[PDB]
Design a protein around this ligand. Structure first.
Ligand SMILES: O=C(O)c1cc(F)c(NC(=O)[C@H](C2CCCCC2)n2c(-c3ccc(Cl)cc3)nc3cc(F)c(F)cc32)c(F)c1
Lengths: 230, 12
């Protein structure tokens, strides 16, 4: 019932590629340092989000078997998951342990960053729900890989090929949820639960950026391609 | 047409 040699291998490979990530401290210090204007925060968001896409493409190309997929499906999988992965990474960083009152300050600073009021509540409740699961670094890494490798995505021609790649990650995640958290047998199901709720941020992702309380909404060409902006 | 994304995937 414990991780097979192949599953230990899959895991370590996923964890190393996921570790190529931007340092979470960098992000949270900057936000906690001073209270920036909605305009400075929009710019920080656009730069953080463009770099995120760049890092996501690299992590994705390294996902076992991703390179073997149809080129157009490769684009639809990345385009279909990029926003979700950014929200999942934002969720992770939100629940990263900080000194007393810092998490409350980080929350208040994000709350007054320039994002429209209509997006605030669903965004923070997802961040808190991820937190209530006290997810490990290997869970965030596997969940990101599972999110990218989702076959039930609009425009995927060969879903079965995507199913073949998502299944070993689902199996590894399940085993980790049973070996490392036997007190909560529902843990794997609850992680799969968060994934369905991650999909709710895609409906109005472009509007999240367009309603930012700034006079001008400038984006990078890469962001324009991933977000449905400009 | 996702030209940038296609480039980032097809490079190396
Ligand atoms: O590459 C990465 O590793 C990476 C990339 C990213 F893009 C982000 N995200 C951000 O920077 C923005 C900031 C950006 C500056 C303003 C405050 C939010 N951000 C959002 C948010 C809110 C709304 C939207 Cl539309 C998108 C994102 N929620 C956050 C919760 C947090 F705990 C936090 F620390 C930052 C958070 C990230 F955290 C990590």
């Amino acid at each position: 019932m414990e991780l097979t040699p192949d599953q230990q291998t899959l895991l370590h490979f996923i964890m190393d590629s996921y570790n190529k990530q931007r340092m979470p401290q960098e992000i949270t210090n900057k936000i906690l340092k001073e209270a920036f204007s909605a305009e400075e925060n929009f710019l920080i968001l656009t730069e953080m989000a463009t770099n995120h896409v760049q890092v996501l493409v690299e992590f994705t190309k390294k996902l076992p078997g991703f390179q073997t997929l149809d080129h157009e499906d490769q684009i639809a999988l990345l385009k279909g998951s990029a926003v979700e992965a950014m929200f999942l990474r934002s969720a992770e960083i939100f629940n990263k342990k900080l000194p007393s009152g810092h998490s409350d300050l980080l929350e208040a600073r994000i709350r007054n960053s320039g994002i429209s009021d209509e997006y605030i509540t669903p965004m923070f409740s997802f961040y808190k729900s991820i937190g209530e699961l006290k997810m490990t670094q290997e869970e965030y890494a596997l969940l990101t890989a599972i999110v990218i490798l989702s076959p039930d995505r609009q425009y995927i021609k060969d879903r079965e090929a995507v199913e073949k790649l998502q299944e070993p990650l689902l199996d590894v995640l399940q085993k980790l949820c049973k070996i490392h958290q036997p007190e909560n047998p529902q843990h794997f199901a609850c992680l799969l639960g968060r994934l369905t709720e991650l999909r709710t941020f895609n409906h109005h992702h472009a509007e999240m950026l367009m309603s930012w309380r700034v006079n001008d909404h400038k984006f990078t060409p890469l962001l324009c391609e991933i977000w449905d902006v400009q | 047409d996702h030209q940038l994304l296609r480039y980032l995937l097809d490079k190396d």
